[PDB]
């Protein structure tokens, strides 16, 4: 449904997107909102680094989950 | 498609300028994200004569997801938290629909004040009292309406109990909370107030 | 969730439709805009009601199902 | 007898009835002009919601009053 | 007031809370005592999985009640 994405800074960012959305989607989709190159961007959820080939449904990122960004 | 929340809200405001005082929405500041609503207690209910203030927040996906609405004014009702004002109402959750407006939302609240659903409660204590002691619930709601919502009158036997308990040195709102939740039995209200 | 629902570009002179307004965005239907008709006969800007139907299976006016 | 109902397109429609008419009557006439089933129809007038079996005479709906339409709601 | 939080292993946690505390506030206190992200906590009492926005008083949870704490997929 909608899900949250916590910065490196501390600001927690809201995104409404579809489970079909590939991880590559979300790197660039996040970059459009307020972000820098997705190639630098790194996404973590439930202890796992999120591979930019897989998609949100593959990691079962449900409604109102929270993703965390770190940098490579 | 762009987030039409501010535009859709602005459009709702231009629409409400054409009508006939039961409900109103107001801006809280320069931010269309954050509004202030007011409803009147519906007639033939214990809220009658009360004016209830609403904290309305408009998510950026509006109108694709519901506004977040809460009672600022305290109220005694099974489907509203007597503490926080959080409303359990299906059109604010699973049953939102985009054609709805803040107008129809507040009218729906007014309708809810007159149509408690105690078997699926937001506030179990109010719901229990609503089912077990309908008379006591009606008086408790009217007292909350009087104390907190400007309603005309409330029952003297209940406000005498509030006065005796506050004279002991307890804050009225704490007294009122204690008596209402203990079904106006002074003995157990006093024990709750004394406890730490 | 991809529907063959009827879609037609709005024409203010060939207006055989009851509704003049899209209740999702609350703007009028305007010429050359793609509208979408749900099985309950309610019409909207396709861009609007398609967004709603991505996340909901229901008509945003009357709540009728939009799939069966 | 002509009364108004503000509907779920935000707009007001004009209804030809009489005070003798049940709310079920008024609700059925509203599904004519607007496509919302009586089931989903809920009529509120001046903060009071209207039950089907009563009449605009019962509720004292006269002249060109406005009823307000909302989708059915349920406290939970 | 005191409530108790029991896990499936058997450990009981004691918290100081107020009836006014939201469930989210309560999960926060469990974190301060056990390190568990609120994300991962599910609190059960009297047939209900508790919702973050409701308070203990909203669920009529009184002093010396015992809540069940069930955890989530931490692995993913
Ligand atoms: C409305 C009434 C009701 O009981 N429910 C869901 C069942 N339920 C419990 O019994 C305790 C918590 C809960 O969700 C409704 O939706
Ligand atoms: Zn539209
Ligand atoms: Zn419809």
Residue numbers in the entry:
A (entry chain E): 1 to 72
B (entry chain B): 1 to 20, 25 to 200
C (entry chain A): 392 to 459
D (entry chain C), E (entry chain D): 1 to 76
From the paper:
Combining several chemical biology approaches has enabled us to determine the structure of a RING E3, RNF38, with a donor Ub (UbD) loaded on UBE2K (UBE2K–UbD) and K48-linked di-Ub in the acceptor site. Therefore D124 was selected as the acceptor cross-linking site and we chemically cross-linked D124C of Ub–C92KUBE2KD124C to K48CUb via maleimide chemistry. However, this complex did not yield protein crystals with our RING E3 panel and therefore we cross-linked K48CUb−48Ub to Ub–C92KUBE2KD124C to increase the likelihood for crystallization. In the structure, UbD is primed for transfer by RNF38, while the active site region of UBE2K encloses the distal Ub of K48-Ub2 (hereafter referred to as UbA), which presents as an ‘open’ conformation. To better visualize the actual active site, we modeled the wild-type residues and refined the model including energy minimization. This placed the ε-amino group of K48 of UbA within ~6.4 Å of the UBE2K active site C92, suggesting that the structure approximates the transition-state complex of K48-linked Ub chain synthesis. K48 of UbA is also in close proximity (~3.6 Å) to D124 of UBE2K, suggesting a role for this residue in coordinating acceptor lysine. The active site cross-over loop (residues 85–90) and the N-terminal region of α3-helix (residues 124–129) from the UBC domain form a network of contacts with the short 310-helix region (residues 54–60) of UbA. R54 of UbA forms hydrogen bonds with carbonyl oxygens of P125 and Q126 of UBE2K. The canonical Ub-binding surface centered on M172 and L198 of UBE2K contacts the I44 patch of the proximal Ub from the neighboring ASU. The neighboring distal Ub binds to UBE2K’s UBA α5-helix and the preceding loop (residues E167 and R176) via its I36 patch, an interaction that has not previously been reported.
